[PDB]
Subunit: 261 residues, 2 copies
């Protein structure tokens, strides 16, 4: 009679979606479609990407923007290549040789989030300058950092001007507001089951001495609050077998000493 | 260096999405936008809804179709009312009195999936006949079953003709094919991390003597395979703290004696 599996599955998908959301930075979604959903070559830097939560969010937003593209898109992960006619050129061309469409987009991805062979870097800027010369082939170099030598080498040797996206540092208040949004669900709007779930969350968050409120006070000091909350919360949802078991965990079992494990 | 949290969160959202997918029944998505995204009153029956997996899927598809509607949408859950000027009329009108838009859509939801006061049923068909008389107000009665007295009472007393949607019974082969699709992920297309994950799944499913293949043989006989697989799989993803831990569980720990718990 009380289909918790329907709630469970929908809550798990929304919590997933909520975490990967980049709505706190509306300027980003527009910045992506502008640079990614075109036939213009560009190099994008993502600075102040200080959290795995942020990286996952940017990545999904990139992943989706490339899905909108009505031209062949190829992915090359440059991490394994650099951090260690040409090897790279041969590999890029093999991928691009897909007789899918006349126009192609090569998306080169480089991630330096825990901050590089000079010889390997030059070989890369060489492939990039050849794709610059090619009409029908466009490149999107996406670098995730926070690099110094990279920016200066890419600027000096190429004709494509690079753009930079500064990931906003949230205030404790902004962070708290967005962490609460993360565990608020919007599926089956108007339903008493969603009303019960969201009312309990809202009221416990406003009750200073509650497990949920106390848990959130810790997230103010914790370095990666979105991930700590996401892990703790997916566990309570997954481990609960009934709707009442879920409410009981939010009210009585959610503590930093209990979740995640 | 190997951001499993990015994979974990994306895999959890996709597994969520995959479960709630109604792509196996493309005729349904079109049937919904036709009947729900209009200003015409209609009564829809969902017969042969034999699984909680199916119900969750139909519900989300309904939930999304109503999001497309550019007119005020109100939800009334008739379950609590019937199974037990008028009480109902007063409540429906209170909701509809939202000074949001001139036109309103009342979505009445009734679920009889484990199969009703005659007095309560008449009161409902009375509210429905008054909304029929009202221009600017449309109703969408959605009944989920498998009812006999309901269909005949709704047909006899109302001017709105009812439609029926027969949920297709999947063959063992269809079921197996779709259960495999459920645990195949499409985020970060082209990435070696997604390639590793999907190759392991594909190869283990083809290896008759593997944990994954043996697990799937049980799903052929199990009455609710999508839910049993979803629960077992969200656990392995959630409980794993590294990418290697995940692969180890799929290869060595996934059994009917171990998952879900
Ligand atoms: Cl975080
Ligand atoms: Cl099922």
């Amino acid at each position: 009679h009380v289909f918790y599996q329907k709630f469970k599955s929908m809550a798990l998908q929304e919590l997933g979606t909520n975490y990967l959301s980049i709505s706190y930075v509306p300027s980003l979604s527009k910045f992506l479609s502008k640079n990614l959903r075109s036939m213009k070559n560009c190099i994008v830097f993502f600075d102040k990407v200080e959290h795995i939560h942020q990286y996952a969010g940017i990545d999904r937003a990139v992943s989706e923007t490339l899905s909108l593209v009505d031209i062949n898109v190829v992915i090359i992960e440059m991490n394994d290549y650099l951090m260690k006619t040409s090897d790279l050129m041969m590999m890029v061309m093999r991928k691009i040789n897909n007789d899918e469409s006349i126009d192609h987009i090569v998306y080169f991805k480089f991630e330096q989030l825990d901050k590089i062979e000079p010889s390997k870097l030059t070989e890369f800027i060489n492939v990039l300058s050849v794709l610059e010369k090619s009409n029908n082939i466009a490149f999107k170099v996406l670098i995730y950092s926070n690099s110094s030598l990279l920016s200066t080498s890419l600027k000096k040797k190429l004709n494509t001007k690079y753009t930079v996206f500064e990931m906003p540092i949230l205030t404790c208040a902004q962070e708290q507001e967005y962490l609460k949004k993360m565990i608020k669900f919007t599926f089956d709007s108007g339903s008493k089951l969603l009303q019960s779930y969201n009312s309990l969350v809202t009221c416990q968050l406003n009750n200073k001495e509650s497990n949920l409120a106390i848990f959130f006070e810790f997230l103010k000091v914790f370095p990666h609050p979105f991930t700590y909350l996401f892990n703790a919360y997916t566990e309570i949802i997954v481990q609960s077998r009934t709707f009442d078991e879920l409410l009981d965990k939010i009210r009585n079992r959610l503590t930093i000493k209990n979740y995640p494990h």
